[PDB]
Amino acid sequence: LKPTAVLRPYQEKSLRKMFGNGRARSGVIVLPCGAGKSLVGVTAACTVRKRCLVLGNSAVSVEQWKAQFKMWSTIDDSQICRFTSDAKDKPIGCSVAISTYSMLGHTTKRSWEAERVMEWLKTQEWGLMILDEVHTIPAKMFRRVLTIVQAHCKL
């Protein structure tokens, strides 16, 4: 996390409660959009320091997350990839991945190119799995993502 990032007390409390010890605890953090939930997610990734997967409910959110990661973290643009049907960044070429539940949770036949990344995603283990707007997660298709992706801790 670049020192430009400013962390508010409630944000710090939520992170301290999530990182009660040297081991990250899985669970849900409820913060308003104006409260900078994105920064907490980025901070958690910077804390875990391991390969992480961010999933948004829309392509607009995926764009927002990319901007926020660049805005708040030392990570370079090439190190971030937005695995999406509409756009390609050679996800296998970098460690940080961003996508959507509609893509990974997709029930119908995958495109040959998207299948390449998904198999790489399936085989790799994710240290942190950030889920945005998790109120949608209990959906029958979206919850499948949790069985498809292998993640050590999910926030």
């Binding site: 710090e12 409390k13 992170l15 301290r16 409660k17 990182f19 009660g20 010890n21 040297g22 804390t47």
Partner: peptide, 18 residues
């Protein structure tokens, strides 16, 4: 350089005494 959260929860209420 580790982050401030490695130490533990704040436990603010433990400061109260009777």
């Amino acid at each position: 350089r580790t982050k401030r959260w490695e130490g533990g929860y704040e436990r603010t209420w433990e400061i109260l005494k009777e």
